[PDB]
Amino acid sequence: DESMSIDNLRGFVDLNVGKWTGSFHQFDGNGNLLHKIDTRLSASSYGEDELLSLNQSLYIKQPTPEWVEYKIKETNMFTVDKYQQIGFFPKERAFSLRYQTAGMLDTTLRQGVLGESPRNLKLPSRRPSLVCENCLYSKIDRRARAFHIMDPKGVLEMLIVFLEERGAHPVLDNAQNDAERINPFLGTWKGRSVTKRSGVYGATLSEADTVAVLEMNDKGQVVQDISSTSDEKKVTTNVHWEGKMSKDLVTFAEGYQMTLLPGGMYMGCPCDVSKCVADLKSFHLEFCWLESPSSRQRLIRTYDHEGLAVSSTYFTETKMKL
């Protein structure tokens, strides 16, 4: 079974290698763009087989073009398993990673906005409780890498989106509508999901046919239904949530929250991760990205009540007509 881990490690490496020109975006909980920073990402590989490693350099554009280099922590067979708890989907081209620290994001904000630590700049906490990356690929050769960051008490402090294309700087907020951001998400989406246990091996725990329903009335009340039917296990689960929308942030009474972003993205996480932990409950983070107004991908990162990522779930969905 060791051969499976090596084949998967190479799959992860090869999917990253290349030159990535991209744009860093820092949002708050209400989807407000705080800073957009030009970035370049150079990913290459070294070694072979079980010693295969992914080295990558992040280049950040400095304000008034000079670039400053950040050396990203090396990714190898040891790190993906022990440190990053990789959730990796080779066929679907998606992955989730844990970061121990938000330092790489702290440096990007510093260098891209500035030349002590000023106060008009929202820097990530020194010891955040959770830093999670979720990455989806488009079905052109570009990707988006979404980051959740929660403060030491488990409350969301920022959202980050790298929009990157391989082989200039990509652009989000491509709107010509000034329409409500949630609209293309409203409706009925059906498709399939596949849940992989985290870890480099990437065992498939299950697969299912999914039905996602999202609605909002004129009063601003949101209704969400997620249906998941497993054929093999003969199980069907329905989950129905109700919440309120206000300034690009849906707050469910559950209480989960999804903030809706430019570019056909939204990101979900609990209001207070610490309540889940205190309640001895599981929780999840979510990153969604639609390519067209009728086709989207979702990535869900699932944690146990101790804040350990236990599995990742990939969704590919198409919007039904009304």
TrEMBL record:
PANTHER family: CELL DIVISION TOPOLOGICAL SPECIFICITY FACTOR HOMOLOG, CHLOROPLASTIC (PTHR33404), NMDA RECEPTOR SUBUNIT EPSILON-1, PUTATIVE (DUF3598)-RELATED (PTHR33404:SF3). This is Glutamate NMDA receptor subunit epsilon-1, putative (DUF3598). It comes from the Eukaryota. Residues 7-167 form the DUF3598 domain. GO terms for biological process: chloroplast fission; chloroplast proton-transporting ATP synthase complex assembly; positive regulation of protein-containing complex assembly. Keywords: Receptor. Residues 181-320 form the Biogenesis factor required for ATP synthase 1-like C-terminal domain. It comes from Arabidopsis thaliana. GO terms for cellular component: chloroplast; chloroplast stroma.
